[PDB]
Amino acid sequence: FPVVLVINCGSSSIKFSVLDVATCDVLMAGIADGMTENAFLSINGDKPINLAHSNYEDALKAIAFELEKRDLTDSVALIGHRIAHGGELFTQSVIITDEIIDNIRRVSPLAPLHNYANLSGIDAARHLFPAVRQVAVFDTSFHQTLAPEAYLYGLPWEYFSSLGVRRYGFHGTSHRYVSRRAYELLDLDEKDSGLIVAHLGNGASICAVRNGQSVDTSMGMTPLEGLMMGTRSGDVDFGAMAWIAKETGQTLSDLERVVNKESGLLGISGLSSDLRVLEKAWHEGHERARLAIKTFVHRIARHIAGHAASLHRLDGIIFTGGIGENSVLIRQLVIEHLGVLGLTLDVEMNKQPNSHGERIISANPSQVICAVIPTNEEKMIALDAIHLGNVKA
Amino acid sequence: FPVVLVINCGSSSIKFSVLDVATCDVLMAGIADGMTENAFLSINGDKPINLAHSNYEDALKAIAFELEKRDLTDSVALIGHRIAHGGELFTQSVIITDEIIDNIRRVSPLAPLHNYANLSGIDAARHLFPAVRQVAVFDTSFHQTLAPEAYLYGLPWEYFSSLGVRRYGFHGTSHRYVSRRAYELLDLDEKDSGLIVAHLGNGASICAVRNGQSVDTSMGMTPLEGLMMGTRSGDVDFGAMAWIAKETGQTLSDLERVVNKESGLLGISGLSSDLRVLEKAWHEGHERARLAIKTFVHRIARHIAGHAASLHRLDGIIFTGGIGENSVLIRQLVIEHLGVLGLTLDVEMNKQPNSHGERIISANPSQVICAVIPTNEEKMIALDAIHLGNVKA
Numbered sequence: 001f002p003v004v005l006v007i008n009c010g011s012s013s014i015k016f017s018v019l020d021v022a023t024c025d026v027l028m029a030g031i032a033d034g035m036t037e038n039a040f041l042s043i044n045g046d047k048p049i050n051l052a053h054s055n056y057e058d059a060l061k062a063i064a065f066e067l068e069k070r071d072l073t074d075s076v077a078l079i080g081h082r083i084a085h086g087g088e089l090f091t092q093s094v095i096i097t098d099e100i101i102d103n104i105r106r107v108s109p110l111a112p113l114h115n116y117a118n119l120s121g122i123d124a125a126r127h128l129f130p131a132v133r134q135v136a137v138f139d140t141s142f143h144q145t146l147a148p149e150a151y152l153y154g155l156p157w158e159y160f161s162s163l164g165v166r167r168y169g170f171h172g173t174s175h176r177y178v179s180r181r182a183y184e185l186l187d188l189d190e191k192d193s194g195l196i197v198a199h200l201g202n203g204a205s206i207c208a209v210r211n212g213q214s215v216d217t218s219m220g221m222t223p224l225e226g227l228m229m230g231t232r233s234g235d236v237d238f239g240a241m242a243w244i245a246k247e248t249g250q251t252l253s254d255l256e257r258v259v260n261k262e263s264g265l266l267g268i269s270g271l272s273s274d275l276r277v278l279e280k281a282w283h284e285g286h287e288r289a290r291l292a293i294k295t296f297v298h299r300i301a302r303h304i305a306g307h308a309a310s311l312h313r314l315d316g317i318i319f320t321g322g323i324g325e326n327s328v329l330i331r332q333l334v335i336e337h338l339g340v341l342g343l344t345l346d347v348e349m350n351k352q353p354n355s356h357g358e359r360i361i362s363a364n365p366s367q368v369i370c371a372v373i374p375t376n377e378e379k380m381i382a383l384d385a386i387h388l389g390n391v392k393a
Numbered sequence: 394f395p396v397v398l399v400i401n402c403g404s405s406s407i408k409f410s411v412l413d414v415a416t417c418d419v420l421m422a423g424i425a426d427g428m429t430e431n432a433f434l435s436i437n438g439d440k441p442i443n444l445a446h447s448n449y450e451d452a453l454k455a456i457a458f459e460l461e462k463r464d465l466t467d468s469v470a471l472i473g474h475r476i477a478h479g480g481e482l483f484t485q486s487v488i489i490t491d492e493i494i495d496n497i498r499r500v501s502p503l504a505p506l507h508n509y510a511n512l513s514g515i516d517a518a519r520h521l522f523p524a525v526r527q528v529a530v531f532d533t534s535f536h537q538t539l540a541p542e543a544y545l546y547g548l549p550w551e552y553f554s555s556l557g558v559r560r561y562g563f564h565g566t567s568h569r570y571v572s573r574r575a576y577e578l579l580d581l582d583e584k585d586s587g588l589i590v591a592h593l594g595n596g597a598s599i600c601a602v603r604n605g606q607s608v609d610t611s612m613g614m615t616p617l618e619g620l621m622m623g624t625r626s627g628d629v630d631f632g633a634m635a636w637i638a639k640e641t642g643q644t645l646s647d648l649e650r651v652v653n654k655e656s657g658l659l660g661i662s663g664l665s666s667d668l669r670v671l672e673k674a675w676h677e678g679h680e681r682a683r684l685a686i687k688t689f690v691h692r693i694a695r696h697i698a699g700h701a702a703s704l705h706r707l708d709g710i711i712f713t714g715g716i717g718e719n720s721v722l723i724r725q726l727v728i729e730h731l732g733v734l735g736l737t738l739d740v741e742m743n744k745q746p747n748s749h750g751e752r753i754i755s756a757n758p759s760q761v762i763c764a765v766i767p768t769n770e771e772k773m774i775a776l777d778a779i780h781l782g783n784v785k786a
């Protein structure tokens with residue numbers, strides 16, 4: 001009964017899951033949070049244990065003691081680490097060696113906060129589990145098949161050639177996992193196929209998958225580009241930002257905080273980054289929440305259609321992520337916004353809750369199949385780890 | 394034989410044309426340039442006359458003397474002024490009164506350089522021609538039919554409500570003129586129709602026209618958003634810009650210059666902002682020019698498709714502007730990039746030079762008619778002026 005421990009270190013937290021190799025089902029999940037004076041560990045969402053001014057190593061030894069307690073330690077056959085940004089260096093998941101680590105550090109200036117937390121998790125896990133093989137899965141690697149016409153910014157070439165300024169894209173692990181599930185669900189030939197995947201969660205992005213490969217995506221060098229999101233602006237006119245700076249004497253630094261933390265659904269609505277709250281507000285007559293949601297919809301539609309340009313044929317549009325999986329209303333309003341693509345909704349199918357899992361929501365006359373496919377990044381990570389567990393290292 | 398004098402004041406220049414009312418054809422055109430120690434007036438592209446350290450008033454009195462010399466002065470029945478930015482205040486062209494002027498000044502912080510030159514032209518013309526009716530035609534007014542879901546940025550509401558931060562769009566006069574010509578050329582019912590117009594000139598933008606009204610457009614609060622252009626970046630990840638600032642210690646001000654003046658086709662190519670030079674470079678083996686053009690194409694395709702989302706049906710795609718009118722290659726590569734919309738090119742029609750004027754370039758099996766329609770902003774301005782010449786003021 002081997003298991004895979006999957007580790008995701010964020011700015012201030014370590015999320016983990018333990019996956020049964022046989023079912024790839026989750027056996028245990030948890031978080032060490034406020035990594036702050038108030039650091040705590042909650043497992044299966046329960047009884048926060050207090051951690052000190054604990055660093056990532058201490059917190060992971062804690063998680064490791066929780067596994068020891070449950071007699072899982074010796075079952076840990078593989079450990080998979082989620083890495084935020086792999087640059088142009090990583091095009092697929094890898095066995096972690098010293099070389100891999102040095103290379104993660106090399107790309108780390110592209111996502112300074114996140115990648116340094118990912119490296120702390122790797123260091124801690126290597127120290128705690130030296131005889132277990134560990135694997136790195138990058139949230140950017142699926143997008144490394146974009147052609148330069150799709151990844152270049154229209155900035156001077158030197159920004160690309162000497163600083164790595166280009167579109168990278170994110171949610172790679174979700175877009176990959178969902179597109180693979182789509183070839184089955186839609187019965188498409190992977191090698192002759194065109195899909196658009198809309199990952200709509202707290203972060204949101206669109207990916208165009210042509211013949212199995214990502215050929216366009218909505219997020220940029222950073223996760224700020226593309227779709228408007230919960231608290232993130234999405235696409236914003238650089239001119240407008242510069243004009244706002246001059247007009248308010250905000251520095252680039254102020255503006256960075258605004259567009260990340262105060263914008264999007266929260267910024268428009270004045271109310272919440274949470275979609276269910278904004279729907280309830282709209283039901284109660286709140287016009288700015290209505291407008292926040294309409295705008296969110298419009299931007300999704302606009303990106304889905306624009307990503308279709310990278311395809312030779314459009315076979316399917318797939319919704320995923322917390323919003324994409326659960327919002328009956330978002331889906332319907334997006335699809336109605338894409339009538340120009342010949343889409344038809346089956347409103348019976350569309351009303352089904354997410355307990356129904358992988359499901360077709362377009363009606364028979366539709367020109368493009370529409371579906372909902374729940375994403376499972378943990379599983380995708382465990383699958384790569386299992387595969388890499390068969391090789392010599 | 395009345396004529397309309399059409400005036401366009403830029404940052405450093407006054408462009409003008411004199412249009413025969415009867416033919417709406419141009420009788421004379423010219424520029425006062427370097428408005429700099431070296432200020433000169435060239436008419437019909439000829440013999441620069443030297444102007445002093447001449448202000449806009451002096452330069453216009455010069456143009457007026459050139460008209461006096463040719464016995465046109467008393468023919469000037471209308472004067473039309475091109476205004477860069479009308480904010481949310483102007484939804485159509487207007488007879489210039491004191492109120493109009495005050496309102497242009499009110500929106501002028503949105504395009505400080507340009508609108509102040511436009512106001513100088515208006516002041517000068519009012520002083521030189523007090524008994525001639527004058528009309529203001531705004532490059533943003535056609536876009537004032539955008540719904541909030543299409544014009545709002547995902548920024549805090551206060552930026553919109555208290556500073557007018559929203560998408561405005563530009564080339565309005567061209568998008569309007571070309572869409573009107575398209576209903577004739579394509580024999581479409583204006584009231585039940587969906588068009589995408591690609592204005593590809595030095596500046597470039599896309600406009601979606603639904604039932605006669607602009608419902609989406611690619612430029613933003615400023616002309617910097619959207620399509621990559623000659624020297625302008627187009628859409629760029631705000632995160633990438635902030636990262637570049639921090640990494641190079643450039644200020645917002647440096648970056649503003651980069652994305653306006655050093656980016657786009659010039660920035661990628663390292664060579665020219667000029668498309669014909671980049672094509673010649675590509676023919677000679679230059680890979681960065683190839684990449685600049687491919688990227689320009691890709692971004693056009695991506696915006697055309699994304700603007701289609703705002704339409705209930707797509708009937709036509711119309712190319713216009715210097716590039717759109719003359720580049721056989723750009724058109725073909727864009728249309729090939731939109732195969733997913735069921736487009737078919739008639740490569741015989743597409744090869745025709747622009748002397749052929751309004752022309753269909755898609756082939757019979759096409760799902761969407763494709764056309765080239767030369768834009769004529771001077772004419773559109775003169776038509777509004779002529780219409781407004783019939784009213785009481």
Ligand SMILES: Nc1ncnc2c1ncn2[C@@H]1O[C@H](COP(=O)(O)OP(=O)(O)NP(=O)(O)O)[C@@H](O)[C@H]1O
Pocket residue numbers: 200201202203204230273274275276277320321322323326327328375
């Ligand atoms: N029934 C529902 N209706 C609408 N929104 C919902 C519903 N349930 C969950 N959500 C939304 O899901 C959003 C959070 O999405 P999330 O859980 O982040 O998906 P994800 O797959 O984790 N994407 P990311 O966090 O960027 O990797 C919140 O705005 C919730 O309101």
Ligand SMILES: Nc1ncnc2c1ncn2[C@@H]1O[C@H](COP(=O)(O)OP(=O)(O)NP(=O)(O)O)[C@@H](O)[C@H]1O
Pocket residue numbers: 593594595596597623666667668669670713714715716719720721768
């Ligand atoms: N035969 C040609 N092939 C390719 N490009 C051409 C050709 N002729 C002119 N152009 C391009 O037209 C571009 C200038 O476009 P422009 O003359 O500005 O159109 P416009 O209608 O004035 N748009 P704007 O200036 O933004 O209002 C240059 O890059 C030229 O190379």
